[PDB]
Amino acid sequence: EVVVVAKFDYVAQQEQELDIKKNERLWLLDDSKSWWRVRNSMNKTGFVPSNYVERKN
Amino acid sequence: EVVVVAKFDYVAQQEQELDIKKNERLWLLDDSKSWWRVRNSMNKTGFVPSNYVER
């Protein structure tokens, strides 16, 4: 984990997100993947690594 | 509507992760927006958009 700095304020839109403020120092726990926000048929939401998602396109 | 499914099983490792089963229907909240996991000085963790932090 590295220390990073928030560029902008961000207001979390779901409980799995973090509220941050511009210029806040944070610890970066994982930048090795692009996580995507997903929801299933059971109405549950969360994050999965992008490569686990298939868009039929 | 673009159909989106789980490509593979993904077994969640942390509370903010979602377990998904291969071939199940999913819905994407964003257009290929990447998120990273961070922690604040009060030890709270969560995801933020990757482009919001500077390394």
Residue numbers in the entry:
A (entry chain A): 5 to 61
B (entry chain C): 5 to 59
Give sentences copied directly from the paper behind this entry.
Nck proteins are composed of three N-terminal SH3 domains and a single C-terminal SH2 domain (reviewed in Ref. The objective of the present study was to initiate development of an inhibitor of the Nck/TCR interaction, specifically by blocking binding of the first SH3 domain in Nck (Nck1-SH3.1) to the PRS in the CD3ϵ subunit of the TCR.
The swaps are located at the exact same position in all structures (i.e. Lys-36 in the n-Src loop), clearly visible based on the high-resolution electron density. Dimers are formed by exchange of the C-terminal 25 residues, almost half of the entire SH3 domain. Superposition of the Nck1-SH3.1 structure with the bound CD3ϵ peptide shows that domain swap and tight peptide binding are mutually exclusive. All of the dimers are swapped in the same manner, but with different juxtapositions of the second SH3.1 domain with respect to the first. The hinge at Lys-36 provides quite a bit of flexibility that allows the dimer to pack in many different crystal lattices. Indeed, the hinge region varies over ∼6 Å within the superposed ensemble, and the distal loop covers a distance of ∼8 Å in the dimers. Given the large number of swapped, independent chains present in different crystal forms and grown under different conditions, swapping seems an intrinsic property of this SH3 domain.
